[PDB]
Structure 1
């Protein structure tokens, strides 16, 4: 029962080369290089599903700090005052409100200040 590999091997290599579209040079053309490129891309994507959550919170916090300091308070005191006021709004929403509704964020700041007062 002699088994030839051509059909399965072509399909196995095509699957990798399709995943490598857009990559520079041999990384999009050459299986040996493309397989390594696609694996490392998956390793990075796994890693960056985690870093994406760190990076966005880093961005949300930076915008809250900017908006808060424009309303006379640092991020750290603002987060504390909101905890003392039992506000459970998270960083993704506070940062969206800081940009898109600057009057509502100012109201959140005077609530935070009131709780520290």
Structure 2
């Protein structure tokens, strides 16, 4: 539950590393292992986490 996170976020432009920082900016300490299930396998809830880190990080 590591490179599945990488594999999920590389669609956007995040390389998991910048996503990682933006998780803390969101204040949601996630994708640590076994969210990464949802990252690939539940793309509905994946898009929610991404949405929160998108405002918190990217578009902030």
TM-score under structure 1 length normalisation: 0.44
In the TM superposition, what are the counterparts of 1:16-55 in structure 2 within 5 Å?
A: none
Where does the alignment leave 5 or more consecutive residues of structure 1 unmatched? 1-59
Q: How many residues align?
A: 58
Say which structure, 1 or 2, has more relative contact order (CA 8 Å, 6+ apart). Answer: 2
Query: For residue 15 of structure 1, what is the aligned residue in structure 2?
Result: none
Match of 1:106 in 2: 47
Structure with more helix by fraction? 1
Aligned twin of 2:6: 65
Which consecutive residues of structure 2, in runs of 5 or more, have no partner in the other structure?
A: none
TM-score, normalization: structure 2?
A: 0.75
- Out of 5, 9, 24, the position equivalent to 1:83 is 24
Does the aligned pair in 2 maintain the 1:81–1:111 contact within 8 Å? no
